[PDB]
Amino acid sequence: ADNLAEFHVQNQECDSCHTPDGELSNDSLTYENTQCVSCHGTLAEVAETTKHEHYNAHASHFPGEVACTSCHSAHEKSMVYCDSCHSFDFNMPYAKKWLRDEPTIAELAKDKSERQAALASAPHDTVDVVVVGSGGAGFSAAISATDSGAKVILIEKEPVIGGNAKLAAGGMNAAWTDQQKAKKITDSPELMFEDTMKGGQNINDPALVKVLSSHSKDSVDWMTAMGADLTDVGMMGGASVNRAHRPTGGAGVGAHVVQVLYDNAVKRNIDLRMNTRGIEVLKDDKGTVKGILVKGMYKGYYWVKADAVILATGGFAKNNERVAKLDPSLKGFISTNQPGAVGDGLDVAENAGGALKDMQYIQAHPTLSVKGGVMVTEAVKGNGAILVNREGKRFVNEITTRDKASAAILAQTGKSAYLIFDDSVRKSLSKIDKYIGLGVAPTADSLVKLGKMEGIDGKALTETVARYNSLVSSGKDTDFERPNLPRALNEGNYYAIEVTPGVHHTMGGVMIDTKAEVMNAKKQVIPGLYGAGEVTGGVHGANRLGGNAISDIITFGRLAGEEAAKYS
Ligand SMILES: Cc1cc2nc3c(=O)[nH]c(=O)nc-3n(C[C@H](O)[C@H](O)[C@H](O)COP(=O)(O)OP(=O)(O)OC[C@H]3O[C@@H](n4cnc5c(N)ncnc54)[C@@H](O)[C@@H]3O)c2cc1C
Ligand code: HEM
Ligand code: HEM
Ligand code: HEM
Ligand code: HEM
Ligand SMILES: O=C(O)/C=C/C(=O)O
Ligand code: NA
C-alpha cells in the first residue's frame, strides 16, 4: 500500500472510517478519529504497544486529546508532528519527512474566487465572540467569555492545541500569592511591576505592566480554582524574590496549565475547531468587527458572524526570515518554538487596521540544548546550576539578562557552554529528569570524568565547582555577582548539558490598551477587535522576564474574553 486508506480498504469498507454520505464531519475530523479509536483504542491504549525506553510517539508531553489524524493521514503519506523539534527513531507507516510550508496570509490572496464565494454565502455560524489560537491566551479568553455569558468558537490552525504555551517550563510570575506566603516568600505587586519595568529597560507601556502585576495574583487564583497546581515557587533571573509558580516538585508549568484550560473548556462545552486558520477579520461599513473568514484544512473557506474577534495567535519566533529583518544578529539561529509560530496572526491584525509596536525587540533564550535542539529551562540555573566554558570556568552571572547571558555564551570557545549541576539541583526540579530522559544530560561520579567525557578541562572544572561552592557558603559571588546562590554542587553525581542561544520570544506585536482592545496607528480603538498574549506588544518592552509570558497570557487572555463578552 502507498497510503493508510489503501491498506485498510483491502479488508474494510469506506464507511469503516467515513460518515454514511462520505462527507468529512468537520475540520477536527471528529467522527473519523472516533472510528480509528473504535478499532485501535485511545491514544493511551495505542501507546502501550509502541513503547521505547525513553520516548513514545503516542505518549508525549502534549496536553489535550491529540487526534490520530495529526500524524496519520488516510489518502496520502503524512508527517510525524514530533519531527518538527526532535529526531527520534520512528517507523510510522506511510510517513514522509517533516516539512512545514504554510502559505502566508498575503499568498492566500490568490484564493480570491474561493474567498469571494465564501463571503457571498451565509455565515456558517453566528456567535458572540471568535477566539483565534489555542494557546494559554486563547483558552483563557474562550473560558472567561463563556463564563461571562458569551457564545464562543475557538479555532486553532495546527492539528494540536497549545501553541508555545504547552512548552513552558520555568514558571508563571505573580505576587503576592498565598502560594508564596505558604513558602515563606515576601513579595508585592509593586516589586513585580518595578522588576518588570527595569527588565524591559523602561520601554514597557507602564499601564500594561500595571495590569500584569496587579492582576497576577487573581490569575494564579483563577487557574488554581480551575484545578491547576501552582504551589512550587522558583527563582528566575531579573526577579528580586522567588515568584515563578509551577507544579509540585518543579515540573513544567506549560503543559499543565494548558491541560487544565483544555479540561475546563471541554467541561463548558466550548466549540473548539482544529486545523482551522483565521484568515481575515471582517468589518462592517462603519469599521467595527462583523466576523471572520477562516480556512479549514478539510472543509475549505467559510465565515463566522460575530461581534468580537480576539486574536490570541502567539509570536513569530519560529519565522527566522521575519526575525532577521528585525534583528540581524539572530539570523540563522535555531528556535525554541512550535512550527506554526510564524506571525500570521500579526498579518491578520494589520490587515484589520491594527498597528504593531516594539517589533525590533526579540528575545534569544540563552540555553538551547546543542544535542537535543530544545529549550533547557532557565529554572535549571534558578535552582542552582552554573555555566562553564570548555576551559572549565565560570564566565558570567548565570541569571543575568537573557541578552547578556546569550552574548556571554556565544563569546566562549565553540560558541557554546555547559550547564553544570549535581543531584541536589536535579532532585529540586523534576523538569531536569526530562533532559536526562532526552539523553542530553551526560553524568559521571566526578567532574574530572565528566569533563573528559564532554571536552571540558576536568581539573579546571573540579576547581571551579570547589570555588563556586565556597562562594555559596560565604553567601556572595565575588566573581560574577550572581545575586542568588541557592545550592552547593556537592550531592551525588554531576551533570553537564551543552547549551547555546536560540530565538524564543517576540516582545512586539499588536498595540492594545488596558482592555486588550486593538488600536490603529492613530491610537483609535478598532471596535470588536481584541489581542491577548505574545501576539501583542507593549507589555514586556525591550526584554521579557522569565515567567512573565505565562502571567501575561492568562491575565490578558482572561481580561479580553470578559471585555469582548461585555462589548458583546
Ligand atoms: C519552549 C518554550 C518554553 C517557554 N517557557 C516559558 C515559562 O516558563 N514561563 C513564561 O513566562 N514564558 C515561557 N515561554 C513564553 C510563552 O510560553 C509564550 O510566550 C506563550 O506561549 C504565549 O502564549 P499565547 O497564548 O500568546 O500563544 P501560543 O501559546 O503560542 O498560542 C497561539 C496559538 O495560535 C495559533 N495560531 C496562530 N496563528 C493562527 C491563525 N491565523 N489561526 C488560528 N490559529 C492560529 C497557534 O498555531 C498557537 O497554537 C516559553 C516559550 C517556549 C517556546
Ligand atoms: C483512522 C484514520 C485510523 C488510523 C489512523 C489507523 C491506523 C493504523 C495504522 C498506522 C495501521 C498499520 C498499517 C500498516 O501496517 O501498514 C493500521 C492497521 C490496521 N487497522 Fe487501522 N487505523 C484507523 C482506522 C481503523 C478502523 C476504522 C479499523 C476497523 C474498523 C482499523 C483496523 C485495523 C486493522 C485490523 C489493522 C491491521 C493490524 C491489526 O491491528 O490487526 N483501523 N491502522
Ligand atoms: C473507500 C474506498 C474510501 C473512499 C471512497 C474515501 C473517500 C474520501 C474522500 C473523497 C476524501 C476527501 C473528501 C473532501 O476533501 O471533502 C477523504 C478523506 C479522508 N478519508 Fe477517506 N475514503 C475511503 C476510505 C477511507 C478509510 C478506510 C479511511 C480510514 C483508514 C479514511 C479516512 C479519511 C480521512 C482521515 C480523510 C481526511 C484526509 C486524509 O486523511 O487523507 N477513508 N476520503
Ligand atoms: C510528538 C508528539 C512529540 C513527542 C513524542 C516528544 C517526546 C519528547 C520526549 C520523550 C522528551 C524527553 C522528556 C520526556 O520524556 O517527556 C521531550 C522533551 C522535550 N520536547 Fe518533545 N516530543 C514531541 C514533540 C515536541 C515538539 C513538537 C516540540 C517543540 C515545539 C517539543 C519540545 C520539547 C522540549 C522543549 C523538551 C525538553 C523537556 C521539556 O521541556 O519537558 N517536543 N519530548
Ligand atoms: C490515535 C489514537 C492514533 C492511532 C489509533 C494510531 C495508530 C497507530 C498504529 C496502529 C501504529 C502501528 C503500531 C505497530 O507497531 O504495529 C502507529 C505507529 C506510529 N504512530 Fe500512531 N496512531 C495515533 C496517533 C498518532 C499521533 C497523534 C502521532 C504523532 C504525534 C502518531 C505517530 C506515530 C508514529 C511515529 C508511529 C511509529 C511508532 C514507532 O516507530 O515507534 N500516531 N500508530
Ligand atoms: O523556562 C524558561 O527558561 C523560560 C522562561 C520564559 O521564557 O519565560
Ligand atoms: Na509580543
Curated annotation (Swiss-Prot):
Source organism: Shewanella frigidimarina
EC number(s) reported in the record: 1.3.2.4
InterPro entries, sorted: FAD-dep_OxRdtase_2_FAD-bd, FAD-oxidoreductase_2, FAD/NAD-bd_sf, Flavocytochrome_c, Multihaem_cyt_sf, Succ_DH/fumarate_Rdtase_cat_sf, Tetrahaem_cytochrome, Znf_C2H2_type
UniProt-annotated binding residues for heme c 2: H8, C36, C39, H40, Y94
Protein name: Fumarate reductase (cytochrome)
Binding site for heme c 3: H52, H58, C68, C71, H72, N91
Subcellular location: Periplasm
GO molecular function: electron transfer activity; FMN binding; metal ion binding; oxidoreductase activity
Name of the gene encoding the protein in the UniProt record: fccA
Listed GO CC annotations: outer membrane-bounded periplasmic space
